[PDB]
């Protein structure tokens, strides 16, 4: 499922399983590729949407992964409930290195 | 922020510029102070002249 | 005990003792899940009067602790001369330190 002459195999199952560094310096390696007419080369788009699909989700998994000092979030609107007769804590949100968590 | 802030009291800011002038030296403070002061008494005089 | 329809029974103690960050906190998100039509009629005044009045209560509590730490304190007001024939009264002048901690 990594074969560069047909651009459907390696899009999203060789892309989310592990890290995605590795297929893309195989891909570049690997020249784009070889013979279309054997192959389902017809309908480019789908293929590169795929692909960007599993690179995206393939992403998400590794800043979730490596998330590991940032799992607490909340929203940014206020007055959201009837009950906001106080003030609650203000802080600030994810705009500083990260030291204590 | 170096400009004028803190203006709209009036009844405070004569009590603080006639009791921070005792043994404190605040000249940047004191220097508006004294001018918006002579300022207003001579806006004041000029009527009774 | 925590019963939603009376948010104003178990609010004081917690006030009282645990701080005040966690009642604020519990009850920010305990908010008014029910609707009017249960409970009482009492709305939310007396709920904020008894939560107001045990935040007093607490703050007063702590300052009697925090000022037993002072030695002397002078007034700016006038008529404040115990010997007004020795010398004329005059204003309080900080040169020492402002504080020892």
């Not at chain 1, 080369?41 to 795929?50: E, H, K, T």
Request: charged share 15%; proline share 6%; with cysteine.
């Amino acid at each position: 499922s990594r074969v560069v002459f047909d651009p459907s195999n390696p899009t999203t199952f060789s892309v989310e399983a592990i890290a995605a560094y590795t297929p893309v310096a195989l891909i570049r390696l690997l020249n784009a590729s070889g013979p279309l007419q054997p192959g389902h080369r017809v309908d480019i788009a789908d293929a590169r949407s795929i692909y960007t699909v599993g690179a995206a989700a393939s992403a998400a998994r590794a800043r979730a992964n490596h998330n590991a000092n940032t799992i607490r979030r909340t929203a940014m609107f206020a007055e959201t409930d009837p009950m906001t007769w106080l003030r609650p804590t203000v802080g600030l949100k994810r705009t500083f290195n990260p030291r204590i968590i | 922020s170096h400009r004028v802030a803190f203006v709209n009291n009036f009844h405070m800011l004569m009590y603080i510029t006639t009791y921070l002038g005792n043994g404190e030296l605040p000249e940047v403070c004191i220097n508006i102070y004294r001018d918006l002061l002579q300022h207003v008494r001579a806006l004041r005089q000029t009527i009774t002249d």
